[PDB]
Amino acid sequence: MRKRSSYLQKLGLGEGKLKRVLYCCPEIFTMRQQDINDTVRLLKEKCLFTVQQVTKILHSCPSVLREDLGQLEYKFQYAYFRMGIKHPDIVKSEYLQYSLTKIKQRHIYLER
Amino acid sequence: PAVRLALQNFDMTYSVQFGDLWPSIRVSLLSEQKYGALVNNFAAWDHVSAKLEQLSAKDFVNEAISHWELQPSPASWACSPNLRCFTFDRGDISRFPPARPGSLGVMEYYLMDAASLLPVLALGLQPGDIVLDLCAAPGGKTLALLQTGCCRNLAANDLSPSRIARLQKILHSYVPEEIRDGNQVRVTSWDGRKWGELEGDTYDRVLVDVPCTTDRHSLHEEENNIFKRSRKKERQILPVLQVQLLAAGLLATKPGGHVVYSTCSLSHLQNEYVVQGAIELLANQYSIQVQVEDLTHFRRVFMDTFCFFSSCQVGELVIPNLMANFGPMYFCKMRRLT
Ligand SMILES: C[S@@+](CC[C@H](N)C(=O)[O-])C[C@H]1O[C@@H](n2cnc3c(N)ncnc32)[C@H](O)[C@@H]1O
């Protein structure tokens, strides 16, 4: 538990940021750290989020840890390419917590 | 691109015309349209009607006629008869399966925009009428005009010989050889604007379903799109052609006869401006008086199935809505007096 508490601290989830994470995703202390590393790796190098943004994503959208790496990549792509949302507004709005279905439903309705 | 130019042009025009109603129309034009199954009366309509009822579909034309008495003359005297067209309930998006051949080797029903039947219904065919469909291809409304069993004679015309092939395909698919080879139906391919000279004062009923910017189709198909950059002049002179065709229809109508003008566009420049423009042209150039007939009772009766833009000055307009996604359909009934 201490070893995971340390991993999460260097990941930026210190200073009480893990309050929201434990409420939605209490599995984070049981999870494999390479599965958590895979999610931060996908966001940082494939979705081009900065370290500060990835920390905020984990804090506000803990659901992304339980998400498939493909589904999560397509969900990001929908905001960046299809909707035209820059990386800061994706993070600030807590966009990645919602389902692609809800996102598509509301975006395409407004678009049309 | 042409699909985007069409939408760009509709955003500019139709946001001004409909105002806060334009979004509900815009989403409907950019979504799947609702179809009605026009029953083929040559193909034993009673079994087809019963089969279509199993799907939870209902004949909107019969529903309408039932309430003709509620809020002058029988429905048959005002509204073209024997047209059975099934649609699913308001809000239902079910699709009809493709029709198959039946009773006389003819297709059981024809799938179409249910609103396309309203100009034919509104035209008010009576038994023994000489009828003209001036811009008939591909034949959806021609088919409905035949289904009434009122046409002594039916002239179906269209300038395009390629679209006439599709009309002939529908007539061969839906109508038995006994009727489509006789003196009851005549398919021509000629300029409709020349009908004032050839066949003047001949027809009792005339349908002028003019070529327009086909608003819904223009947003789906990129090939042969009226909003292409090369077709800029053709699109701008479109209200001239539409008046020329309506005036020709009126000149081919007998004095006392009736004409229905229609489009599948929301634009007032193609709708009310063409009706007023053709009525003026005949009063000035030919000294012929044409009266626009009120379709308020007709509208009110059919409001249960379609969304109408009730702010129409002349004629009526069915606007598409997700609850009843029946494409733009403008229509105006007229009577030639002199
Ligand atoms: C909206 S379509 C008619 C649809 C048809 N009544 C139906 O319900 O299937 C308009 C038609 O006008 C035809 N057209 C164009 N210019 C014409 C002209 N000068 N005379 C006659 N038909 C013409 C086009 O070829 C086109 O088929």
Retrieve residue A61's tokens. 């959208």
Residue of B nearest to A110 (CA): B27
CA B19 to chain centre: 26
> Which residue has a Cα nearest atom 20 of ligand 1?
B192
Gap from CA of B77 to ligand 1 centroid (Å): 28
Chosen for mutation from B14, B24, B27 (greatest number of chain A CBs closer than 10 Å) is B27
Cα–Cα distance measured from residue A75 to residue A85, given in angstroms and rounded to the nearest whole number: 12
The set of residues, in sequence order, having a beta carbon less than 8 Å from that of B314 and lying 6+ positions away, is B272, B275, B276, B292, B332
CA B88 to chain centre: 20
**Is A109 within 8 Å of chain B by CB?**
yes
8 A C-beta contact, residue B59 and residue B302: no
**Is A110 within 8 Å of chain B by CB?**
no
Q: How much helix, strand and coil, in percent to the nearest 5, is found in chain B?
A: 40, 20, 40
Pairing, β B203-209 against β B253-263: parallel
8 A C-beta contact, residue B209 and residue B122: no
Count of C-beta atoms within a 10 Å radius of residue A90: 21
The set of residues, in sequence order, having a beta carbon less than 8 Å from that of B15 and lying 6+ positions away, is B22
Place of tokens 């702010």: B311
Gap from CA of B205 to ligand 1 centroid (Å): 17
B316 lines ligand 1 (CB under 6 A): no
8 A C-beta contact, residue B91 and residue B323: yes
List the catalytic residues of B: 264
Which domains, ranges and CATH numbers included, belong to chain B?
1-112 (6.20.240.40), 113-338 (3.40.50.150)
Helix B2-18 crosses helix B22-29 at what angle (to 10 degrees)?
Answer: 150
Cα angle: B120, vertex B11, B222; to 5 degrees: 70
Retrieve residue B154's tokens. 């039916």
Rounded to a whole number, what is the largest CA-CA distance in chain A? 51
Cα–Cα distance measured from residue B262 to residue A81, given in angstroms and rounded to the nearest whole number: 42
Helix or strand (DSSP H, E) at B283: helix B272-285
Place of tokens 């691109």: B1
8 A C-beta contact, residue B135 and residue B211: yes
Cα–Cα distance measured from residue B151 to residue B161, given in angstroms and rounded to the nearest whole number: 24
B159 lines ligand 1 (CB under 6 A): yes
The set of residues, in sequence order, having a beta carbon less than 8 Å from that of B154 and lying 6+ positions away, is B131, B132, B133, B142, B145, B146, B184, B185, B186
Exposure letters A4-27 (e unless 16+ CB within 10 A, then b): eeeebeebbbeeebbeebeeebee
List binding-site positions of B: 139-141, 158, 163, 191-192, 209
B138 lines ligand 1 (CB under 6 A): yes
- The partner residues of B330 in beta bridges, in order of sequence, read B263, B317
Helix, strand, or coil here: B229? Answer: helix
Exposure letters A94-111 (e unless 16+ CB within 10 A, then b): ebbeeeeeebeeeeeeee
Residue of B nearest to A111 (CA): B27
Retrieve residue B105's tokens. 């080797």
- The partner residues of B109 in beta bridges, in order of sequence, read B39
8 A C-beta contact, residue A95 and residue A77: no
The set of residues, in sequence order, having a beta carbon less than 8 Å from that of B307 and lying 6+ positions away, is B318, B319, B320, B321, B323, B324, B326
Place of tokens 């080797």: B105
State the number of CA atoms in the 13 A half-sphere of A48 facing the CB. Answer: 5
Question: Which residues of B make CB contacts under 8 Å with A?
Answer: 26-27, 30-31
B192 lines ligand 1 (CB under 6 A): yes
DSSP per residue over A37-94, as a string? Answer: HHHHHIIIIIS---HHHHHHHHHH-GGGGTS-HHHHHHHHHIIIIII---HHHHHHTT
- The partner residues of B37 in beta bridges, in order of sequence, read B86, B111
B193 lines ligand 1 (CB under 6 A): yes
In this structure, which amino acid lies at residue B123? L
Q: Do the Cβ atoms of B30 and A109 come within 8 Å?
A: no
Cα–Cα distance measured from residue B316 to residue B79, given in angstroms and rounded to the nearest whole number: 15
CA A23 to chain centre: 15
Cα–Cα distance measured from residue B328 to residue B216, given in angstroms and rounded to the nearest whole number: 7
Cα–Cα distance measured from residue A95 to residue B72, given in angstroms and rounded to the nearest whole number: 61
* Among A63, A74, A65, CA closest to A98: A63
Task: Tell me the CA distances in angstroms from A60 to A46, B41, B61, one per residue in order.
Answer: 20, 64, 56
Cα angle: B186, vertex B188, B192; to 5 degrees: 120
List binding-site positions of B for S-adenosyl-L-methionine: 139-141, 158, 163, 191-192, 209
Contacts of A105 in chain B (CB under 8 A): none
Resolution (A): 2.9
DSSP per residue over B151-170, as a string? Answer: EEEEEEE-S-HHHHHHHHHH
8 A C-beta contact, residue B306 and residue B117: no
